[model samples]
Target chain A: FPTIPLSRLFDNAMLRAHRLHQLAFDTYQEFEEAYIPKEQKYSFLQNPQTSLCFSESIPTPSNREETQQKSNLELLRISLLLIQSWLEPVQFLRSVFANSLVYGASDSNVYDLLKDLEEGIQTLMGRLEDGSPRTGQIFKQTYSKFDDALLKNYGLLYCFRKDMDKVETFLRIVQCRSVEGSCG
Target chain B: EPKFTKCRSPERETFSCHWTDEVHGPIQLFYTRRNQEWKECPDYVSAGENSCYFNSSFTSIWIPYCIKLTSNGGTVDEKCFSVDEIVQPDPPIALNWTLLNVSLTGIHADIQVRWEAPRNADIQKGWMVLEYELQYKEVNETKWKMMDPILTTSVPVYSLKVDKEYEVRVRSKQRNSGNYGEFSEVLYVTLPQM
Candidate 1:
C-alpha cells in the first residue's frame, strides 16, 4: 500500500461510490414500478410509516457535514461501513418484492436490477474498504408477512435513498480533492 | 521518484503543485519565497491526487518561490519560478447573452455575451485584475473564431448567419500575464428564424 498513494486509492473509491449511488437510484425506481401498487406510490415517495423491522433504530449515515473534516481514508472507511449495513435489508426487500414475470421474452426486471445494484454496492465496498460490517437483523415480521405491505416497503426504500445520499456526499467531498485548482 | 509539474495558480491567492507520476510514500513539500526561511506546506493533503496546495494567506505573486518535494528524505524535485509566469485566472461564470435581429428577412444576427469574474479572486484581495477571451464556432464547424481579450465581462459578436447554431465559450487570465484559464462550459446558441 505504501507504493501507491492514498489519493489514488481515494479517487478510485470515490468513483465507485458515485456509481453505486446512481445504480441504487435505478434499482429503487425499478422496484417501485415493478411491485408497488400505483395508488401507494405517493406514500413511498413522500415517506411512510412502516412496521418495525431490522432492529427499529434503523442504521443511517450521519446527517452532519463532519465528513468534510475526515481524512480521505477515514471518509472511505466510514462510507464502506455505512453502505455495508444496508446489504441485508435491501436483500430482504428484493426477496419480499420477489419477481414480476415476463415469461415469453428475455427482459430485465426489478429483480435483476436490484441484484445488480447489490453487486454494485459490493464492488464499491471492496474498493472503499472496511470496518465492522454490522447490519441489523429483523426480529419481527418480514414485509411479506405484514398485512400492510406498503408500510414496510416504502420505509425500506425511503431509507435506502438516504443511504445513496450519504454515498453521493462522500464521493462529492472526494471530488473536491481534484487538480481543479480550487477547494470545493 | 515523483515528477513534479503543472504548478499554477489562477488568482495568485493560492497555487498547486502536481505529481505527474507515481508517489511511493508520504511526501513533504517545502517552499520558500526569496530571503524567507523554508516552510512546509500549510496544507499537505486535501488539494487532490498527487498534489499539494498552498492557500491564500501564505502566497504572493510579486515574490518568486522555489519549491521542493521529497519522499522519505529523498529529494524528488525542485524548481525556482515566478507566480506571474504561471498566472491563470479562473474562467468567467454565469454566461448569458441576448440576440438582436438586424433584418426582418433574417439577414443578420448579433449577440452580446456577458459573464462575471470568478470568486473576486477571494478575499485574497486586489492584487490580480482579470480579462476574458470569448470564442465561438458554428455547431458544425471545426474551427473556433477567437475574439480579442477584453477587460469587460461582455463582448459584442456581430453578423452571425441567421438560423444557424453556434457554440460559445469563455476563458480568462490576469491582464498582465500571457497565460489563460481553461475555457468555460460550451454554451450553444442559434439565431431565431425571424
Candidate 2:
C-alpha cells in the first residue's frame, strides 16, 4: 500500500483531539469547582454509601439550597460535553478512514476497529439522550474505555505521541502540528 | 414507534402507576378508585410511562382503580390494576461488596455483599419490610449463581476466586408476596491478583 498523507491526517486528527481535550478539561473544572463544593455542604452526600433516589420526599434542585440549581446546570453542561467528546474520537477515526479509502488505501484492521468503536459510541450516545442516572454513569464509563484504548494504542497510531496523559498528549500533538504547518 | 402498551401499580399504599408508549412524551394522567371521586394527578404527583406515584390513600386493596393517560397524537390509554395483584417492590439500591480475609493466590477468599432497601416512598414509610435475592458471577462467566432471598440487607459469599473479577447484583420484593423489582445496577469488582 502507498503511503497516505501523514502530515494532513495528523493535522486534522490533532485539531479534533485538542478540542476534545479542552472540553474534557473544562468539564472537570466545572465538576470540581461547582458541583463538589455544593455537594460537600449537603449532609446526605457526606455518607459515601447513601444512595439518591427519585422518591417525592427527596430534595430536588427546586427545593434545595441556592447552589443546587447551579450544580444541576453544571452537571448538564458536563454531561453534554462528555457526550460530544466521546463521539469525537469515533468521528475522527471515521473521517480518517474515509479519506484513506479515497486515496485507495484499504486496511481491514483499521476498518474493523473504527467500525466497532463507532457503533459502540453511537449506542452509548443514544443511551445518554434518555437522560437517566444509570445511563449517565454508563456514559462516563464508556468515555473511560476510549481513554484507556487510546492510552494503550498511543505509539501504534502515528498522530498521537507525547509524555503525558492521552488527552494532553493529543492536544500537544495538535499544537506541534499546527505550528509546523504554519511555519511551512 | 407509537403504540400504547399497558399500565399497572407496583404496591398498595403507593399510588405509583406506569405505562408504555413507544413515543415517550408528556402524559396527563387521571385516576379513580371504585365509586370514589375521579381525581386528576396533582401537580405534585410525578407521572411517566413507568412511574406515576398516585396517592394511595384514596384507593383500597383488592379494589381495582382505573387510570387514564391523555395520549397526544395517539389513542388514549387506560388500565385497571389493584394493590394485591400488582405488588412490586422497587429495586434495591447501593449494592456494595468487600473482600474479606487473606487473599494472595486464592487462599481463604470470600466476599461480604451489602445493599440498602428499595427507595420507594411507601416502602421507606414502613409499608413493608423487603427481602432481597442476590445473584453473582465471575466476570468471564455468562451464568449467574442465585442465592435464596434473605430478610437482611447483607450476605456473605464463601465461593469466590481470589484473583478473578466478579459482577454482583441484587433485587428486592415484599416478604412472601409481590413481584420482584428490577435488578440493581451491576457492580463490577476485580479481586487483587497479587
Candidate 3:
C-alpha cells in the first residue's frame, strides 16, 4: 500500500482523527456505518488533547488559494469542514461539561478555541441555511477562510509530533522512480 | 593479484581490477569517490544481500547532494542512493517580563506590566506571539477575577487595582498551539507599599 501521512507515527490520536475525517465526510451512509458504531469513536474524538491538538493542524489562511489548486487539498478541506462544523459545538459543550465534571480543571486555550470554533460553525451553518448557489459559494468561501488557519495549526503540530525521516523516505521513493525529475 | 599495470586512472565507467582470489565473472564490488579521490566500499553485507547502504556525516557538507556506488573497479553498474533533507523554521524560545505601573481606588483598580519575546532563535517551533492576563482581588477580598489572554502590545502592561494584595502572571500564546508553554515566572507588586 502507498504510504500515506496516516500510514506512518501514531496509530493513536492522529490516526483516529484521520479515520474520523474519513467517516465524517463519507458520502455513502454505509461508510459512516462502518466505524461509527465502535464504542471508542465517540471518546476518541472527544479527547481533549486529540481534538485540541488536531484542531490546530488546520492550514493557514494564506494557503487556501494554493490549497484549492490541488484536488486532494480541496477534497480534504471540504471533508474537514463538514466534520468540524458539527463537531466543534459538541466539543465545546463536552468540554464545558468535562470542565465542570473535573471540578474547575480544564484547558482554557481549548475552551477559547471551542468558542471561536463555535462562531466559525455558526457562520458556516448560516451559509448552509441561506439557500442559494450564492450562499453555497458563501459556505465554501467561509470554510476556505477558517480551513486555512485550521490546517496551518494542524500541519505544524502534525509535523512536530511526526517523524520527518518517514517523510524523507517517501520522498526518496518518488525520487528513485523519477530520476529524471529533480525533486526536493 | 594481477601484476603492476598501466599508469592512467581507470576509466570512469570500468576498471581492470585483478583479485587475489580466483573469482571471476561479475562479482558484485563496491567503491566510493569524493573530492576527486576514490576508495573501495567494503563488502560488509553478504553476497546474497540485494543492497548496500552507507552513511557518512563528514562527507556531507550541507545535505548530501549525490551519492553513487559502483561495482568493484567499474562505474557502469553504479547506483546512487536517494536522500534529501527538508529545511524547517527554528524553534521558539521562552519569553521575559517586567511590571510597569498600577492604580487602586475603592472597588475600581488598574495594573500594568510588560515583556519581551525571546530572540536569536535558531529554530521556530514554539509560541511566536504572547498574551498577558490580569487576576486580582481586593485587600482580604473574597476572590480574584481573571481576564482573557491579551494579544496586542498596545496595552504594554496590564493594569488592575484591587483592595487586596494582588499578583499577576503573563503567558505567551503561539499562533499555532494552544499548548501555551509554561507561564512566565509570576511577578508580584503590592498596593502603596512603603
What TM-score goes with each of the models?
A: 0.48, 0.42, 0.24
lDDT of 3 by residue, A73-174 (tens): 233334335334333333332322342322222334333332332332233223223222322322353322222333333332232222122222222332
Kindly list the per-residue Cα lDDT of model 2 for residues A11-100, writing each as its tens digit.
333333343344334333433343345444353345422322112121223322432333322333333333333333433344333433
Show model 2 residue runs off by greater than 4 Å.
A1-184, B1-11, B20-30, B35-45, B48-53, B68-77, B102-108, B119-126
* 10 residues in a row with least lDDT, candidate 1 chain A: A138-147
Measured with DockQ on alpha carbons, how good is candidate 1?
0.01
lDDT by residue for model 3 over B35-146, one digit each (tens)?
A: 1444543433422233332332212211112223333444433332212111111222332344444443343334455544434211111112334444434445566656
Model 1, range B35-93, lDDT digits (tens) per residue? 45778777767777777787755765334678888777887788877666677777777
Provide the TM-score of chain A alone for each candidate, in the order shown. 0.50, 0.27, 0.22
Interface root-mean-square deviation, candidate 3: 14.3
Model 2: what TM-score?
A: 0.42
lDDT of 1 by residue, A1-184 (tens): 0122333333334434554455456555666776677667665455534423332243323655566555444544444445545545555465433542322111223233234334433433354443434333322112222226655656666556556667668655644653243243
lDDT of every model, 2 decimals: 0.61, 0.48, 0.32
Cα distance off (Å), candidate 1, residue B71: 3.1
